[PDB]
Design a protein around this ligand. Sequence first.
Ligand code: MG
Ligand code: MG
Ligand code: MG
Lengths: 116, 112
Amino acid sequence: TANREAIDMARVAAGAAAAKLADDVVVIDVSGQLVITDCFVIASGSNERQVNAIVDEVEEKMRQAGYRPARREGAREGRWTLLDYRDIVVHIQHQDDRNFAALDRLWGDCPVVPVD
Amino acid sequence: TANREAIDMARVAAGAAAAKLADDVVVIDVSGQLVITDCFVIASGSNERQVNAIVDEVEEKMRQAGYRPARREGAREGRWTLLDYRDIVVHIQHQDDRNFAALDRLWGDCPV
Ligand SMILES: [Mg+2]
Ligand SMILES: [Mg+2]
Ligand SMILES: [Mg+2]
């Protein structure tokens, strides 16, 4: 399964998104699929303000956890942001833009990490 | 349009993939679309071991040209490997998995 250190990072990220009332907050164990990243963290906002508040909360809480800033990515015209912390990767998106079948297609065979 | 520092990185990464006999090597300018990444370099290997060697070639010359180490990722079965250099992302894939349709609906308007 996923390394304990990676799960702890995921816990911090998911707790930050939950603190800003994100929807779809799930930690995916991708340790059996990928060679580097162990946890994928999904989160969604109902508006773009919230999406960005979730993004900033995750970064601020990850900094407090002692980690270096994520390598970031997003679409200039899109409403998503990708945060790469290596052991984990965080993906935050406006719920209206999400493709949920595509998510399940990609990670449907991966265990959910009950992180609470 | 795409960065000088990125084009000269894509040049190196694509040439390296060329030196180790990759197929369907493409440099895609995504600078118009993305915030951070400026270019993608996609390539195919005929098999998992060729994908492995292609990655080696790319990483070897990128280090030689004094570039930052890649943030790597890969499928555990070696079907694909990705190297993130920030300014460019290199995507090497087993030709059987290369979906050119999905590429088109997504980086089709980008110069290639
Ligand atoms: Mg792992
Ligand atoms: Mg750019
Ligand atoms: Mg190697």
